Design an enzyme around this catalytic site. Sequence first.
Site, PDB file in Angstrom:
ATOM      1  N   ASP A 208       0.816  -1.208   0.000  1.00 19.63           N
ATOM      2  CA  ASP A 208       0.000   0.000   0.000  1.00 19.63           C
ATOM      3  C   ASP A 208       0.853   1.263   0.000  1.00 19.63           C
ATOM      4  O   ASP A 208       0.755   2.081  -0.920  1.00 19.63           O
ATOM      5  CB  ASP A 208      -0.945   0.001   1.210  1.00 19.63           C
ATOM      6  CG  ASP A 208      -1.979  -1.103   1.143  1.00 19.63           C
ATOM      7  OD1 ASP A 208      -2.189  -1.655   0.043  1.00 19.63           O
ATOM      8  OD2 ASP A 208      -2.583  -1.415   2.191  1.00 19.63           O
TER       9      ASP A 208
ATOM     10  N   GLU B 109      14.428   9.255 -11.517  1.00 19.18           N
ATOM     11  CA  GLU B 109      15.687   8.814 -12.097  1.00 19.18           C
ATOM     12  C   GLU B 109      15.614   8.920 -13.612  1.00 19.18           C
ATOM     13  O   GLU B 109      14.619   8.512 -14.217  1.00 19.18           O
ATOM     14  CB  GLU B 109      15.999   7.374 -11.690  1.00 19.18           C
ATOM     15  CG  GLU B 109      15.941   7.128 -10.198  1.00 19.18           C
ATOM     16  CD  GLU B 109      15.840   5.655  -9.861  1.00 19.18           C
ATOM     17  OE1 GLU B 109      15.259   4.901 -10.669  1.00 19.18           O
ATOM     18  OE2 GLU B 109      16.339   5.254  -8.789  1.00 19.18           O
TER      19      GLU B 109
ATOM     20  N   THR C 113      22.725   5.963  -6.732  1.00 17.15           N
ATOM     21  CA  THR C 113      22.226   5.120  -5.659  1.00 17.15           C
ATOM     22  C   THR C 113      23.195   3.960  -5.424  1.00 17.15           C
ATOM     23  O   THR C 113      24.336   3.973  -5.892  1.00 17.15           O
ATOM     24  CB  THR C 113      20.821   4.623  -5.988  1.00 17.15           C
ATOM     25  OG1 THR C 113      20.907   3.402  -6.730  1.00 17.15           O
ATOM     26  CG2 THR C 113      20.078   5.655  -6.821  1.00 17.15           C
TER      27      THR C 113
ATOM     28  N   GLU D  57      23.625   8.151  -2.641  1.00 11.48           N
ATOM     29  CA  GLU D  57      22.513   7.823  -1.767  1.00 11.48           C
ATOM     30  C   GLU D  57      22.429   6.313  -1.630  1.00 11.48           C
ATOM     31  O   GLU D  57      22.840   5.570  -2.527  1.00 11.48           O
ATOM     32  CB  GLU D  57      21.185   8.379  -2.296  1.00 11.48           C
ATOM     33  CG  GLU D  57      20.643   7.651  -3.512  1.00 11.48           C
ATOM     34  CD  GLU D  57      19.293   8.177  -3.951  1.00 11.48           C
ATOM     35  OE1 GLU D  57      19.209   9.366  -4.325  1.00 11.48           O
ATOM     36  OE2 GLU D  57      18.314   7.402  -3.919  1.00 11.48           O
TER      37      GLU D  57
ATOM     38  N   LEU E 124      18.652   1.030  -0.136  1.00 12.44           N
ATOM     39  CA  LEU E 124      17.715   0.485   0.831  1.00 12.44           C
ATOM     40  C   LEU E 124      18.011   1.066   2.203  1.00 12.44           C
ATOM     41  O   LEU E 124      19.164   1.390   2.508  1.00 12.44           O
ATOM     42  CB  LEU E 124      17.804  -1.048   0.884  1.00 12.44           C
ATOM     43  CG  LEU E 124      17.560  -1.790  -0.433  1.00 12.44           C
ATOM     44  CD1 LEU E 124      17.784  -3.284  -0.259  1.00 12.44           C
ATOM     45  CD2 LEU E 124      16.160  -1.510  -0.962  1.00 12.44           C
TER      46      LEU E 124
END
Lengths: 422, 191, 315, 316
Positions: free
Chosen positions: A90, A174, A334, A372, A375
């Site tokens: 969700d 991205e 990332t 960055e 996870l």
Amino acid sequence: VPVFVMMPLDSVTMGNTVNRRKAMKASLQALKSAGVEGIMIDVWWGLVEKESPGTYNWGGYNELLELAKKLGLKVQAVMSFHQCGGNVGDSVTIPLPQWVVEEVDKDPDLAYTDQWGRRNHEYISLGADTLPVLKGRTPVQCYADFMRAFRDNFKHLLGETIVEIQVGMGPAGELRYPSYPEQEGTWKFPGIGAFQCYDKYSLSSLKAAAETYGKPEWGSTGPTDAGHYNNWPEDTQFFKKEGGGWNSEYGDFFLSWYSQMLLDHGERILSSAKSIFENMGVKISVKIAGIHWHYGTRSHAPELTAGYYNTRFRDGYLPIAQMLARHNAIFNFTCIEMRDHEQPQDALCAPEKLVNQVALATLAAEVPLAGENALPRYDDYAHEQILKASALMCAFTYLRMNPELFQADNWGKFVAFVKKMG
Amino acid sequence: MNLNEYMVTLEKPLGIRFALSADGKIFVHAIKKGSNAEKARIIMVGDTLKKASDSSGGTLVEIKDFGDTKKMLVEKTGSFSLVLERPFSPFPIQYLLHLSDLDLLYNRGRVSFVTWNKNLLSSNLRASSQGSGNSGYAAFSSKFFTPQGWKLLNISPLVSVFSEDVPGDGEWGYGNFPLEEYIKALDRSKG
Amino acid sequence: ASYKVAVLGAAGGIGQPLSLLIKMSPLVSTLHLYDIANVKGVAADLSHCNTPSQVRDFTGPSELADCLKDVNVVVIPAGVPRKPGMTRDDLFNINANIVKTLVEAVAENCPNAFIHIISNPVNSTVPIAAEVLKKKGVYDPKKLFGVTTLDVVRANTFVSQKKNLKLIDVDVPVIGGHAGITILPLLSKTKPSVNFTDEEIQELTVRIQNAGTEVVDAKAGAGSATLSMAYAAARFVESSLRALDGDGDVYECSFVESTLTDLPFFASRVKIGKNGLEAVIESDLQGLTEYEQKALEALKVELKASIDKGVAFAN
Amino acid sequence: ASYKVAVLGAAGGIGQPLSLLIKMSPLVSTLHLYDIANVKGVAADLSHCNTPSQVRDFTGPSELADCLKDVNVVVIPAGVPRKPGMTRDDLFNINANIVKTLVEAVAENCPNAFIHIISNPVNSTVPIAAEVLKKKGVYDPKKLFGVTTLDVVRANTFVSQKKNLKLIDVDVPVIGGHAGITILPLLSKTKPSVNFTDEEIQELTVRIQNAGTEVVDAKAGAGSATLSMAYAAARFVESSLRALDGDGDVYECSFVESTLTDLPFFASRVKIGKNGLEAVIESDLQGLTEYEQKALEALKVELKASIDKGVAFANK
């Protein structure tokens, strides 16, 4: 090295009001007491231009950014022109503006399309990138108007509190193609993805390039054996390392076409952003997908599918670094904290080798680079990995703000990483 | 490399008004409402026409001047493949809206031009066989000559604004969208 | 527009359309006109056209000396039309007198210019001009031409009418002179690749070499060709202006003094440059068939007679 | 480029150069020539040029019917130059009779033929043609023109010479008529916008009005302007043909039955499309200076008198 933390996806409700305002006081007071340099906020398209193609509601965002100024934290605004929300779980959903969605419904080719016709509504395609399809405006015009409204509203903040503008140039902000449709479980890790270039608005440019190269057969469609999202690189004859189609003339032509269209989309939006935000004490950044998996394979099939023409023979990040140097843009990457052994080895994931290649490209193009994590993890192992990767980073953005980070041990680890990086 | 370019297949009637300017480039001047080019939302106004096809599709021949497009526009039935080149900067249709068709003309005072040199006649009066032409033409509109002929005579001025026998009596506009908002966005961009 | 064209005999039947076509040409900057009278009228008529080429008028030798002061291309269509019952011999005397006077004037005013003799018959009036220039001491064989492109244009038209070709594509050269049986159309050497037949050669020859009389009989003896002659003369004039501009592909069938044969003057395809007769193509007389050979023998005899008559008149 | 042009009266001072110029055009494919005599010679003279436009000749009213069969554009320059000592009214009568005959014969043959009228006086001959088309019910105001392009050409030439302007850019719209005084060069509407002094407007308007008389004086004893007429008429024929070919930039100053003023027929710049007068530029009478308005008001009585002569002759 400056340290930046990201506001959750519930930083602003569906209405233009700040969510859990006292909670945000608690979080931000802890953050600046921790010495964190700054914070990264998603300026959403569907929460500012939700219902009127001209009216830009800035209530909750104005409160939030003035509030972050009051607590003395720099703001990295991410011009989120993408949809999010329900894909597998969700979480929280921030759709595209309703008029934009209506335009996409009346003309379905305004969204990225795969080989089999599945249309991704997370973002507006680049085939219609300069066509007046959004209430008489081109997508460049819509994004430029949004940036102009942001600049006009937050002019008193630019150069004083807001110090970076990441430009949303694709899904998840991205610059890439939506080759990972986790919605309905269409793609699951590990995988390679598909070619999101099957809009007729981009097949037209495919035909143009095919005719320019004198090949009136390479523009009819994309590869016929590229493979389904969850297939393996060796399962497809296109992406196989043993003399596959990625090495052929047709493969080189199509992959150059794909990467150069992604680069041209980047060129257009970056030039618009540079014109809008010129000489205001702020920097402009572009986020690039950290596609760590299937790095060991020669073809680098996930990179090829997500718009990066990066192989063992061609360095696909060098042209992107050239573009960012041309527009004086920051390369945001990332997958910094992850390790090779932590990721599955059967998929030949090489996050550290990928980060090394990114660093080499940025050094070659003299492009400042920021990192960055992919996870959210609080471990000192990942903290030391990030420390080493920064030692070799102009800034680091940390995912994700949540009360879990304010627990005892997690908070101690986070602050330890903060003053280690500082 | 040529990513500003795009190929589109249209069934007759094309529904496009072309504008030959004093540069050799054949723009797109206006689009008929409800036409096939109106349905194909990729064809804008001001996109140069680089190549074109025939009724059966044939070969995608490059277009140099009015001579190549004359054969394409003479026909009335078929499917034509057109290669268009998007301008490097968006076309200022502000000038098309403001300036009248008389303002954007090359031979306003229709100075006569009588010539026998085939290198000065457009590629419908050349016959391109052995040498510099056999027959001479006396023309007043500068649409019958090459850019070399125009240079000898001397948004860029337009030497002609031509079309075909498009039926339906649809109004010549600039595309199906809020054109007022499009212009407002254009001035916001340039300002 | 940096070259000057003068027309001598510009108020006649050919003079007016010729001056019109010359004026509506961007290569022309100034167009002088001369005739016995009506020059002011024709200049006033033409001066209202909006082609950027000025028009000037002159009458009598006193104004002729000013007319030919800085001309680059001289055209001489100054010929008296045939009269109903007037002897061709004295007609030749009158026309040759006009040509001789005008050539003397151009020699004494500006000899360094192209000369396009139109006054019929050029077979006799081109040697007259050459000998007058020799007497004046300013003869320039490279810069003297006899306009023969009328028969070339007629040949193109007649070939394209006989065989269903593209008329703007047809191009056939003509050898010889400009009056009578001296018109030799090189159909077998025409530029468009064709396959002629003997009857086609016969009909095309008899039509091309007898077109002036066809126009005369169509006009019931009123006069010779005026509009087609003006068109052909303007064609040659624009070719000469292109040559003056440095064009390297000015291949015109002109009646000039050539060393390719015993005849002092011959009408052949020639290359025209800034200095005039840049070169003469010899291949026009290579590859001919026996029909061209016999007709060329008769043509050689006729040209010898005509050039001898012109020499006798001039000296 | 497959359009047919007929020229009725193509053997006079204007007819021959006009026929030559129309033949030497990229748009004409067929050229029909008519006159009471001396047309076979001109047709034979023109047929020797190597241009694609075919040429046919016609003599007599019997071949007149065949002349205009399926003709896209008709040009009528037929007329008689004024003889020494000839009566002005008599010359008007001959010219009007010729125009009447030619237009009444055009009517049954090809009403939709972009009828161009050259025979002077234009102000009196255009209405005659209009009513002879009216009696046949084919009076279409969009397909009947009086060629006023000669005055436009003269205006371009004179303004270029006087003001030292690039002759390729100057375009001067002229309104009113084609009878000298009824000429009004809207100099303030010169497309390369250039200021004109009072003295520069003076002598320049009047030379534009009196160019015909000046040419008549220069050609003392032999008609009027003929090469300029051929040039301007060929320009008008090319403009009409390319308008019939599309070409949504075709603007030309012509004398047509226009309700722009009280005068039934007026000369103005109109846009020409495949069916005739696509639109009429009314702004030609908006923004005029004091001198232009005074001249416009002065020429009303003369133009109305010429139109009255035309209607009286046509209804006589």
